[PDB]
């Protein structure tokens, strides 16, 4: 009866990782959305800052629980809605495999992605030199290893760990594109992700919006 409320702006890759998860879990009707538009600065309103001192999206509120990181939101939603399905995290080693890749997205891929994208968005960077994209390419190399050792990022099955990564990969891809030559396992995985039926609505919409803003800044 109690519905989680997702505070979100789908231009954000972390948000889209959540939106992808909600869709894959089949719980779109079970999660209420509350738009928090970054470019309008609604994330700096007193109510939202009180909700999350990081003044960032996404945020999940469920009863009195407040999660302020897309990755914790994703694992929490798997725990309460996905325990008995294909995305289950009940097994401790499977849970750890998935969490390990969520950590990789949060602490490596999204960090390096964000540096570049925030730089362009706020005009701190004007020209992308190679040194801007080198950390992203190092993250691609790690991802290529992971996708050599298993079919998806965390194991041979799709898991929620694939969603934040693809959300990031489809963002920073527009400034640091994947080479099939250089990263064949990752390019193939990315195409497969793109074929998911909920990808268009849960991720591409927001990516296109961000592409509009990026073409405007460039």
Ligand X SMILES: N[C@@H](CCC(=O)N[C@@H](CS)C(=O)NCC(=O)O)C(=O)O
Ligand Y SMILES: O=c1c(-c2ccc(O)cc2)coc2cc(O)ccc12
- The option from Ca ion, ligand Y, its own copies, none interacting with 69 (CB < 5 to 8 A, set by class) reads its own copies
- Residue choice 16, 24, 34, 46 for contact with Ca ion (CB under 5 A): 46
192 binds, among Ca ion, its own copies, ligand Y, none (CB under 5 to 8 A by kind): none
Measured between alpha carbons, how far is 128 from 106 in angstroms, rounded to an integer? 23
Q: After which residues is the chain broken (C to N over 2.5 A)?
A: none
Query: 59, 2 in Cβ contact below 8 A?
Result: no
Sheet of strand 32-35: strand arrangement: 32-35, 5-8, 59-62, 65-67
| Nearest CB to its own copies, comparing residues 62 and 211 | 62
Cβ neighbours of residue 218 under 8 Å, at least 6 residues apart?
120
**CA-CA distance, 194 to 191, in Å (whole number)?**
5
* Residue 115 CA from chain centroid, whole number: 15
Residues 52-111 contacting its own copies, CB under 8 A: 53-54, 62, 65, 67-69, 71-72, 75-76, 79-80, 92-93, 95-97, 99-100, 102-104, 106-108, 110-111
What does 39 bind: ligand Y, ligand X, its own copies, none (CB cut-off 5 to 8 Å by kind)? ligand Y
Helices 184-194 and 130-149 pack at an angle, to 10 degrees, of 80
Determine if residue 150 is labeled as part of a ligand binding site: no
**Sole residue written with tokens 């997702």:** 6
Contact status: 97 vs ligand X (CB under 6 A):
no
Select from 8-16, 126-134, 143-151, 202-210 the region that touches ligand X (CB under 6 A): 8-16
Q: Is the peptide bond before 139 cis (omega within 30 degrees of 0)?
A: no
Interface residues with ligand X (CB under 6 A)? 12-14, 38, 43, 55-58, 69-71, 106-107
Interface residues with its own copies (CB under 8 A)? 53-54, 62, 65, 67-69, 71-72, 75-76, 79-80, 92-93, 95-97, 99-100, 102-104, 106-108, 110-111, 141-142, 145-146
Interface residues with ligand Y (CB under 6 A)? 11-13, 38-39, 41, 113-114, 117-118, 121, 171, 210
């Amino acid at each position: 009866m109690s519905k989680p409320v997702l505070y979100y702006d789908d231009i954000s890759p972390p948000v889209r990782g959540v939106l992808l998860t909600v869709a894959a879990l089949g719980i779109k009707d079970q999660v209420e959305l509350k738009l928090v538009r970054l470019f309008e600065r609604e994330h700096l309103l007193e109510d939202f800052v009180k909700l999350n001192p990081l003044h960032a999206v996404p945020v999940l509120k469920h009863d009195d629980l407040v999660l302020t990181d897309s990755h914790a939101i994703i694992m929490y939603l798997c725990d309460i809605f996905g325990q008995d399905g294909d995305f289950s995290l009940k097994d401790p080693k499977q849970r750890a495999r998935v969490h390990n890749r969520l950590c990789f997205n949060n602490a490596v891929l999204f960090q390096r992605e964000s540096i570049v994208m925030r730089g362009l968005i706020n005009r701190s960077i004007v020209t992308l030199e190679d040194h801007h994209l080198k950390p992203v390419q190092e993250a691609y190399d790690c991802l290529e290893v992971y996708l050599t050792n298993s079919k998806f990022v965390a194991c041979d099955q799709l898991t929620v760990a694939d969603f934040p990564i693809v959300a990031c990969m489809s963002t920073v891809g527009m400034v640091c594109p994947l080479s099939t030559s250089r990263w064949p396992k990752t390019a193939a995985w990315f195409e497969t992700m793109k074929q998911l039926p909920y990808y268009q609505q849960a991720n591409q919409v927001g990516v296109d919006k961000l592409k509009e803003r990026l073409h405007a800044v460039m």
